[PDB]
Amino acid sequence: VLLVFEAKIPTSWWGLNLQFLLVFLCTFMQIVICVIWLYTAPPSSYR
Amino acid sequence: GCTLSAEDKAAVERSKMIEKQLQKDKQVYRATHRLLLLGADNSGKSTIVKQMRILFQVDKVNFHMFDVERRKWIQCFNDVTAIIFVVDSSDYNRLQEALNDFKSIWNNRWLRTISVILFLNKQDLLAEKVLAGKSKIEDYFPEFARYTTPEDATPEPGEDPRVTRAKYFIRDEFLRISTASGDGRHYCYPHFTCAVDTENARRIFNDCRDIIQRMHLRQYELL
Amino acid sequence: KEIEFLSWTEPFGIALTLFAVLGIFLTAFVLGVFIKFRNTPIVKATNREL
């Protein structure tokens, strides 16, 4: 929305795919952290 | 480069040079708001073009107007940013013909996407007329007596309530055209206009930017 | 030795589960409203895909 309301330039589904791709980018960096954690030093339940 | 194609190497150099200038002109073209002035003969587009002749361009964004006879060429181009329809509301009888012209402009399916930056022009002379007794709208548009000044339609301080009644009557007679055809793909923005007014230009720029935003709001489906 | 954890049967586990289910129900309600009213400009102005 910021890009829309700042695009004073007359001419700046693919956009929706790009939105989902950006969300996937951030979440996927966290997925990388999570997966490294889970198969390198998995958590455990301890009594 | 290796430069090994002889006459063809000269041709390659020429083509690369031409492509460089094509990109250089694309820099200007992709940023220019192109606008057309469908002003009537009596409308008063002379005032606007005189103001533009004074100094068009705003900040760093460029603007390019065209002005202008039957229109077999108005439908040929749909890349225009918006239409600037000067109207001389001072002449009441020619006002109806201007309203019909705006009907034709707004209902042209070829320019369906195109918004219009409407100008009620020479409205000060309308004030001079209506303060006098000669000018009677009841003869030409009889519905003026049936009209009421809208408190929503914000007036200007130090203005005759009958002046506002008349002026708002002209403008909403024009805006009946826009609101009736609420297509959304194109909106009409009216602005009161007068001669010897350097401010007119910035209004266009303002309005222009607005349309662009809506177009983006249309591409990204936000609106 | 008493085995201790946050339990489903524990009375406060009941309260926490009720609040989590209430949150899920409210999210479902909001989603349903944004589906039935998907074309209202207020909803569309919020990038309804996201």
Side-chain angles (χ1 to χ4, degrees), chain A residues 1-12 14-47, chain B residues 1-6 10-12 14-15 18 20-33 35-40 43-51 54-61 63-69 71-74 76-77 80-87 90-93 95-123 125-128 130-135 137 139-142 144-151 153-158 160-171 173-180 182-196 198-223, chain C:
Chain A
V1 181
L2 276 150
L3 272 164
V4 175
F5 274 101
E6 193 64 26
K8 42 187 160 301
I9 52 182
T11 303
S12 48
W14 157 242
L16 307 187
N17 306 340
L18 190 57
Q19 302 173 178
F20 299 139
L21 185 54
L22 294 174
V23 189
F24 178 54
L25 168 61
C26 315
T27 313
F28 171 71
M29 186 66 204
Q30 187 179 5
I31 296 279
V32 176
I33 301 299
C34 167
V35 169
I36 296 301
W37 175 20
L38 258 60
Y39 70 92
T40 293
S44 47
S45 68
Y46 163 55
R47 277 162 64 104
Chain B
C2 293
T3 311
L4 300 181
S5 298
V12 176
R14 206 165 204 182
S15 48
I18 288 174
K20 267 191 263 160
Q21 282 68 242
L22 282 178
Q23 179 180 1
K24 275 152 161 173
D25 291 331
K26 201 187 200 85
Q27 312 296 338
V28 176
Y29 190 89
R30 303 327 306 260
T32 307
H33 294 75
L35 293 173
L36 188 153
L37 183 63
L38 295 170
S43 49
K45 64 182 181 293
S46 67
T47 80
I48 306 313
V49 294
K50 170 259 184 176
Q51 193 276 341
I54 299 174
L55 265 178
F56 71 110
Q57 182 187 348
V58 176
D59 200 7
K60 313 284 293 314
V61 61
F63 293 87
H64 190 273
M65 266 195 257
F66 301 104
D67 196 9
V68 294
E69 166 67 22
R71 311 155 198 151
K72 187 54 183 177
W73 55 280
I74 195 172
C76 299
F77 53 72
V80 61
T81 309
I83 301 299
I84 297 169
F85 185 21
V86 187
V87 176
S90 281
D91 284 331
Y92 306 105
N93 208 356
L95 183 63
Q96 172 51 40
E97 211 67 19
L99 183 63
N100 293 116
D101 189 358
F102 185 63
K103 264 202 251 183
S104 163
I105 297 169
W106 187 260
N107 292 345
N108 181 11
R109 284 291 169 241
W110 293 60
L111 305 173
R112 213 198 47 67
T113 302
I114 301 299
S115 294
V116 60
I117 300 169
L118 194 153
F119 281 171
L120 283 72
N121 197 15
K122 301 205 291 303
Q123 310 300 312
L125 271 163
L126 169 56
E128 317 287 343
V130 65
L131 61 83
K134 184 268 199 184
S135 66
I137 300 171
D139 302 1
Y140 295 154
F141 299 152
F144 175 48
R146 308 269 78 173
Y147 186 74
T148 61
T149 181
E151 61 156 49
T154 301
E156 159 185 339
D160 189 358
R162 301 312 175 182
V163 161
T164 61
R165 201 169 177 265
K167 253 167 69 182
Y168 285 115
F169 182 76
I170 296 89
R171 64 180 293 165
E173 287 298 332
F174 277 101
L175 297 203
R176 224 161 201 181
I177 290 181
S178 61
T179 59
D183 294 330
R185 299 289 182 272
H186 65 279
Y187 309 105
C188 174
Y189 317 92
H191 314 277
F192 302 125
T193 315
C194 297
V196 179
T198 68
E199 311 76 0
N200 283 327
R202 55 200 270 290
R203 293 221 161 101
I204 298 284
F205 159 86
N206 298 359
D207 291 331
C208 285
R209 205 170 50 200
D210 186 74
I211 293 91
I212 320 299
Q213 293 181 4
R214 309 274 206 170
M215 306 168 56
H216 290 57
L217 288 177
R218 194 141 281 101
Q219 183 164 110
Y220 300 152
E221 321 200 17
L222 296 170
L223 188 152
Chain C
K1 289 177 191 182
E2 201 56 280
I3 304 298
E4 185 160 347
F5 53 86
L6 176 56
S7 174
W8 288 106
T9 300
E10 171 175 349
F12 296 92
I14 308 169
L16 281 184
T17 300
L18 267 293
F19 277 110
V21 173
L22 171 58
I24 278 163
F25 280 23
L26 287 181
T27 311
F29 179 87
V30 166
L31 187 41
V33 171
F34 282 12
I35 307 284
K36 299 295 186 290
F37 291 84
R38 62 184 168 274
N39 275 307
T40 298
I42 297 89
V43 188
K44 204 145 170 193
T46 68
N47 204 357
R48 59 189 172 196
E49 290 66 40
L50 290 177

